[model samples]
Target: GTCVNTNSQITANSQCVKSTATNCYIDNSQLVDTSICTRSQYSDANVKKSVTTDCNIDKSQVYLTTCTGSQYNGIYIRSSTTTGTSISGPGCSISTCTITRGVATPAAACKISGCSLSAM
Candidate 1:
């Protein structure tokens, strides 16, 4: 007799939402809903501003950026094998890398503190 215990299983048929779009309109004549119009414009503009700001930050200092289908932001490192050491790659290369958030340069900000290569 054989006994096996498994807690998790990997499935191949997982579906993910990649992108989404919404349609909006404004009534500039004040005949329709003014609050709705103002709110929509404000929200959209703020969203754009946030995206732009996140993109303008020095890439060299940014380690990672979050990707939201159409847009991306800086990536946050949780754990790594190496720290403070420069590696040649997309976000860790001498040249800037284009991520979902935007263009970023490899800088010390990208380096995770207290991170080091494994001895094994």
Candidate 2:
């Protein structure tokens, strides 16, 4: 149906926003506001907020913030600052980034500097 800024349970629709979305469009997953999606499923969207469940993204290619049950590469960035990017959870392969604020639980796969150099 292609809705925007939604805050209700969504399913089988063309698009939606601000709510839990599942199997709505091209992919079967959940999303947050502002972030973009292509493939895979189950993710959260925020400005540099890396969270995921099942996804198949590339190394340091995930600008989406969150992902779920899937396979990908390299590292995931949760939050970032001038010092480094803060990330946690499992999904990433390498963990060699920095964190000005917050903590990385597993300290897994990801880059530190160039990854979080961009600004919105």
Candidate 3:
């Protein structure tokens, strides 16, 4: 599976990936048949026809998907059309992506040096 680009389309086991933190950004893209989106920013993604699982999205228009460890901002999951979608979190924004099932955890504050500085 190759990387899907912006304004592009892919099918069946495709992926949207970036080597850096700000590359391979998928904008106005589409995916179908179990595609994967990772480590990239997505905007205007109409994945309404997909039957996918476990992806990250920000403000992207989505339907029939499973998003875990995700961050959502200004996104619409299109109620009633939603089915079999789950959003779980080790990280997530508040009240952004509305879903029927899943857990939205409060974001923990970033720790310095991966630990709390105490009595130094």
Candidate 4:
């Protein structure tokens, strides 16, 4: 005769708001709720040196950015009032396109999906 022992497995599930203002989903083995991520709007003067504006604008303008993990993601407008000179650089992605008079302006706001991380 033979005998076998079976062990049970435990699983934990939790919900969390994504880093972006838009809706997001994440699945990680180790998840912690921390305010490590942040979002903010800034006037042209307050922007950091690391942030670059590829378009042409006047001396004063405005922009926005959100922190993700260890990177800053958002829109960098060359001028708040100027037209035809805005660019958007997604998380870790290089800036692309140029907006003119609000015609082709880069997407400054987050999309519905935005960004996410997961593990299985």
Candidate 5:
């Protein structure tokens, strides 16, 4: 049956919706009910990436990744090895490299005396 949202209380319980030519049909919870769109309740299953050729301690895509406690990241490698045969890090120009992530070191984020590093 067609969802006759005559009053347009639009829900998202995974059911067939009304037509594209409805009158009271709305866009949001204000105009129509959106209580069924439980999409916000789900986790952010997204991935982020980054690449660097220099010897950086923080070779991370932290800023690019959504680490609001919902998403995770994936690292890759493409090192400029002496030969495309076999090479690694610690002392080499990494045009290609397999990296790591997900380490929260917010200790350096706070520039304070453990609380406030605020003296010029």
Candidate 6:
């Protein structure tokens, strides 16, 4: 069975990021919620996220990986002025292309599910 031992542990060295955001979604089992995950540096959502120090007026793409394997991407926004249909990097596998009423520049506020745990 896929039931990992309750006490198991797994981890990814993650960080806080800022950039244009995505209204990403998954089967609850695969959503990136940074609010809680950042501190713990772990996630079980089968998605990869990018952790970074943010810059408002400057545009850059620097990566400090916290984990490896099944994952998506999370890009936080530095300034409220960062506007656009959507930003890039902090990119993911499958996603939608239209934002009817989404946050223009999302920040590193929320978090994903699960963390460095897997019966270890």
Tell me, by lDDT, which candidate is best: 3
Give the Cα lDDT of each candidate: 0.20, 0.36, 0.37, 0.24, 0.21, 0.23
Cα lDDT of model 4 by residue, 1-120, tens digit: 011112211122312221121121222211122211112222222232122222211122223321222212243332222222233334312233232332334566423222221211
Per residue, candidate 6 scores C-alpha lDDT tens digits across 6-117 of: 2322222322222212322212222132321221112223222332112111122212222211122243222122112223343321122211122322335323222111
RMSD for each model, in Å, please?
20.0, 10.8, 13.7, 18.2, 19.4, 16.0
User: What would the TM-scores of all predictions be?
Assistant: 0.15, 0.27, 0.24, 0.18, 0.12, 0.16
Judged by lDDT relative to the true structure, which candidate is superior, 2 or 3?
Answer: 3
Give model 6's clash tally: 25
Error of 6 at 104 (Å): 2.1
Q: Rank the candidates by lDDT, best first.
A: 3, 2, 4, 6, 5, 1
Tens digit of per-residue lDDT, candidate 2, span 4-99: 432333344323444343332322233445554333433232223344333443433344354443333344554422222333334443334333
Candidate 4, residue 43: the lDDT equals: 22
- Judging by TM-score against the true structure, name the best candidate: 2
Worst 10 residues of 5 by lDDT: 111-120
Task: Please list all clashing residue pairs in model 3, or write none if there are none.
Answer: none
Indicate the worst ten consecutive residues by lDDT in candidate 4: 1-10
The runs of at least 3 residues in candidate 4 whose Cα sits more than 4 Å from the true structure, single-residue gaps closed, are: 1-50, 65-120
Per-candidate clash tally: 12, 23, 0, 5, 11, 25
Model 1 TM-score is 0.15
